[PDB]
């Protein structure tokens, strides 16, 4: 019944918000940004990913809807003018909820803080050289010196991953991955190269060698910590739940997003 | 109590073959290579590879172990000198089983037949130029131009996939995973590039469109199937079984076989 | 002068052939296939290569042109509604020529095989596995182990090389590159895995380390040599020269083929 | 008979300095650091780097010589036992010298300012996307969205530009070769992702298409320049020299440092 509505912001957003509004209007649905249980995000990828976090804490109590009012999103993938046959099917309700795995990083001092994430979660170097022991399960792996470290969801494999050379995977796998950002290679330096696709409570953790600086992202948020002990990866236990209408195949929509449309 | 032993048939490999029979000899151990219940190769990941072959229309009957008799294999992951002890544990038993995904391929003619691979299955033109349409639950994802696919379990991974920029996948995730070898891309041309990692219950399949004779290779057995109407790849529902007597975890093997031993 | 016409043998192709050859006759242009000046190609890069192959001991008396029925191509690029303003321009002649370099490859035996390629001479193995040793100049670089070896001339860098991870040169750049096909890279194999760009004069040798028998590929005719001893490969001191009518740019054509036209 | 020498500033490399000049004290030689013939570095790539730098107004006046007191390096390639064998040969002289192709890169602003690069240039966005026009030789080649571009010299090409992709390119070779970071590729966004090589005098610009402001990096030396109008590629006119003793073949040092020493 409780719902909101977040806007790119744009004339073309704005507007199609405000019809939702008043098209929600003429059903037993109430306008929440406090606690809503349907979250409805009006722009690109970008703008539902602002609306993921602005809804964090609540994410098991929420579905979410993406429409984008540019290009198909990965995430905002229905047409703004399906916008009134959306504001009929939630109203009633009675709709599937599909659920994505989220990715969960810890970032220690010398104290903790973590973050969910919905695409990606990288570490790169405050502005030396990075350098990173990579240990899992504690293991140590190997030694990564190179330009950073991009760890990935599933449905994030589409995004940043998918630049690096990462592996395209299907969201209902329970896994993350991690790829390379231009890695060193020589006599002296050796890393596996290869994408890393780890299940669920496998522990991937950074640690410093040198310097203790890096500038850590989360999707499109960057944050510069300083004083890092250690950077834990792993998938969260925590999920992301999309009301769906109808079926939009995941392979379907990466076909219509890469080879054609 | 039934076990049996494949060989790489050199002299360092037939000997050890020898000691452990005799080893077993010690034990309430019988000798069968018709009904084993334990399958011990010894040579390579090859000589895994052949072992388990052999024996795959009693997968769920058997535990494999694999000696290494030069470097490390995946498969063949414990040392000569350990035969003595391996003997011990096994002849007592009461060892873990690990259980690994394996890989269906279905070949359709106009007939059918099917394939179990433990590393990867690849599809080639039989001389002319390789294309085909490749559908993913019925769905039509892309038509690949090149030289060929290569559809991999988990624990394959590491192997040919590995060499075609795949993904490294911990073999407790129940996927398969398609990486393209060669592809052309221009205007004319478009496949997604990317390696692609399907759950289980994915159906991809491969439509010839103009040539249809394939060379297709299972492990390392290729063999040049003629008038091929449809290639179809799953997750098994079948597994592989390893007997375990100690820790030996996946990542750990990837760095030794990689990174350094 | 003299000159002559290849066809893809389509309609389209043969029909524009003889029209052409209509309109020469209105010139003080002769016909002759044996020994021409100008040769023609009608159809696609594959019947540019097959004009270029059946000229390739005139080369140096003969100016190429490829006009393209189908979409564009690297070598065919000039439009079927440009004939007639060629056939001008050709007539009256005084056109300038471009030169590509081209790569020589030579194989020995147990005698000697030499192949002129305009895009790539690549190596493969004849069913066992490819191995063979790479020796620059002389000088032992790395035992290849894996699928095989594409060496590429400046204007074949964006044919096979391209799809094999290759780096795009200005045919200006009197070179020729290397590119690997999947090789194995663990704790016993190593390979530089980057492509490789050679000038003028040095010598790559590929030398077999088991087996002999290797499926060698010049542009596209594949062959099967057996006994092989060693395959060198260096830049022609040959040249393909193109008759050019108007600014046609390297990287213009690279930007229409594969970014957008 | 002028020269220097630059140190890492670690003890092994002080005192080799110390040791050296001692040496060189015994012949006609005149240390200075103002206008030396001879630039001797003791350290690794980055110190000779540094030298470099230091000296770029007077590269034509100016042979270098690297040695290296840790790992090989591709410019410090001699060994610190050769120490006191070097000394005698430069003394007397009559040593062959030996160039390699440099980048100038120029920026615009809103004045203009150029820099001399021995290993490569690189542009990354100050924060914001990095999405840059790329033009060659005035024509408008791709759209670049991602994380930043790399132009490398023909030495470089084994430094970054190799962990990006690039390929590898004797020194011999006038040319640069541009590589991409992490493109974005989709429907809406496209690049060519292959590594470009580019021959002497043509010029590759990036022009801004939103954000003006970019990090670029020449050498290890990064710098924030604001209000950028253009960024322009080019081979120097400009070479290095070194000073050779003995034959140590460019693809020789290539498999040293990558493939086994
Ligand atoms: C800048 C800016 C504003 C947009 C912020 N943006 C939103 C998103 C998204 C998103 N999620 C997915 C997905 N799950 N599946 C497939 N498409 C997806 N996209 C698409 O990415 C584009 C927007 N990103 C950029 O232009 N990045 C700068 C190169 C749009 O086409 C979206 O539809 C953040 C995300 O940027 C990704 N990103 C960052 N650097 C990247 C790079 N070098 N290459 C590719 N992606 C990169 C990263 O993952 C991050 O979370
Ligand atoms: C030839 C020959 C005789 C050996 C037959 N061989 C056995 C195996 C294996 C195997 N399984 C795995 C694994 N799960 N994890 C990691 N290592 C693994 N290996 C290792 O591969 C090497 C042997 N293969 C080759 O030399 N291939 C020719 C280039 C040895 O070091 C093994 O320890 C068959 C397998 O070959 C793989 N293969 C084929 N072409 C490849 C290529 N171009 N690059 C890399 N691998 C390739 C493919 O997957 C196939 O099933
Ligand atoms: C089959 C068939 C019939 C065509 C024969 N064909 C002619 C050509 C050409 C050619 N030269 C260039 C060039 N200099 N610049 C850019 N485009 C170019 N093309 C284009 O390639 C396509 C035709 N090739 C294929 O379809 N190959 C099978 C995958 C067409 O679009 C041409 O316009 C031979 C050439 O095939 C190339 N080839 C082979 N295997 C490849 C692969 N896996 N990926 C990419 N290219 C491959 C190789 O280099 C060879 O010489
Ligand atoms: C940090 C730091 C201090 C060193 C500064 N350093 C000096 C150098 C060099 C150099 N020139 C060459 C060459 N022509 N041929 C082959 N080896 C070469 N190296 C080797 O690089 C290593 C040092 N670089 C790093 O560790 N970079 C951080 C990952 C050492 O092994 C050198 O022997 C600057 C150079 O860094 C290169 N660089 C930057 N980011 C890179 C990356 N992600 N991957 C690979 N290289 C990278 C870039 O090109 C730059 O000019």
């Not at 409780?2 to 098209?23: Q, V």
């Not at 796998?173 to 780890?198: D, H, K």
């Not at 300083?226 to 990866?233: G, K, L, M, P």
């Not at 992301?240 to 054609?260: G, L, N, Q």
């Amino acid at each position: 019944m409780k719902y909101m509505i977040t806007s790119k912001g744009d004339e073309k957003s704005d507007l199609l918000r405000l019809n939702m509004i008043a098209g929600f209007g003429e059903y037993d649905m109430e306008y929440d940004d406090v606690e809503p249980e349907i979250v409805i995000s009006i722009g690109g990828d970008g703008t539902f990913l602002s609306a993921f976090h602005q809804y964090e804490e609540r994410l098991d109590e929420i579905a979410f809807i993406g429409i984008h009012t540019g290009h198909l999103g990965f995430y905002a993938d229905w047409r703004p003018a399906e916008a009134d046959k959306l504001v009929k099917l939630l109203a009633k309700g009675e709709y599937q909820k599909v659920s994505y795995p989220l990715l969960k990083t810890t970032v220690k001092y010398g104290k903790e803080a973590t973050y969910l994430a919905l695409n990606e979660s990288t570490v790169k170097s405050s502005g030396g050289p990075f350098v990173v022991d990579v240990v899992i399960n504690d293991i140590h792996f190997e030694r990564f010196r190179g330009d950073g470290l991009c760890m990935s969801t599933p449905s994030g494999t589409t995004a940043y991953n998918k630049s690096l050379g990462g592996a395209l995977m299907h969201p209902s796998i329970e896994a993350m991955q991690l790829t390379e950002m231009a890695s060193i290679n020589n006599r002296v330096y050796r890393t596996i190269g290869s994408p890393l696709v780890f299940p669920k409570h496998h522990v991937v953790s950074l640690q410093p060698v040198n310097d203790k600086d890096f500038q850590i992202s989360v999707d499109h948020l960057s944050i510069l910590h300083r004083d890092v002990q250690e950077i834990r990866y792993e998938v969260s236990a925590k999920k992301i739940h999309f009301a769906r209408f109808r079926s939009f195949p995941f392979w379907r929509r990466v076909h219509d997003s890469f080879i054609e449309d």
